[PDB]
Amino acid sequence: STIPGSAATLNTSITKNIQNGNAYIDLYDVKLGKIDPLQLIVLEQGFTAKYVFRQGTKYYGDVSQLQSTGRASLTYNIFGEDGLPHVKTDGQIDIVSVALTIYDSTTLRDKIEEVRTNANDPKWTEESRTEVLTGLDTIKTDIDNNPKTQTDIDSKIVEVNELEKLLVLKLAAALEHHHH
């Protein structure tokens, strides 16, 4: 919840990015400039924070530099008004470390739009179109609102491919409706 003596606390109300006290960032959102890591914490008056990501063998000071998915860390270094690190009551430097999952819904989102476009072709029965769009809407709502791992993203791509196979041609339906 809040590290004893720390001037910062994780903003758990930002449920797209914070779950179970862990952070998640979707590179899709990053490329749209939608993610400001500073908005994920609440700071006491008189203190500032600078974030630093560690991923692989590199530190990154700008969220826009994240380019690979996987596990990483997100740290907020906390500074007093003099620009120096805050030292807490307990004699330790004030830093807030958060486990980070980086994922990318970009290909899933493209896939979803491709199936949507396909499904909207009037050659498909309305009943199959509707079932397919319903499944796509469920997935899209989920990724819009809820953080995922890349494994989960990849599994949803498979679900989307499978949904697309539910489309039925009006031609096929008209010939099933025939009687000899």
Curated annotation (Swiss-Prot):
Domain of life of the source: Bacteria
Transmembrane regions listed in the UniProt entry: none
Protein name (Swiss-Prot/TrEMBL): C protein alpha-antigen
Disulfide pattern: none
Subcellular location as annotated: Secreted, Cell wall
Gene that this polypeptide is encoded by: bca
Function (record text): May play a role in both virulence and immunity.
More info: Identical repeating units define protective epitopes and may play a role in generating phenotypic and genotypic diversity.
Boundaries of the shown chain within the full protein: 57 to 225 of 1020
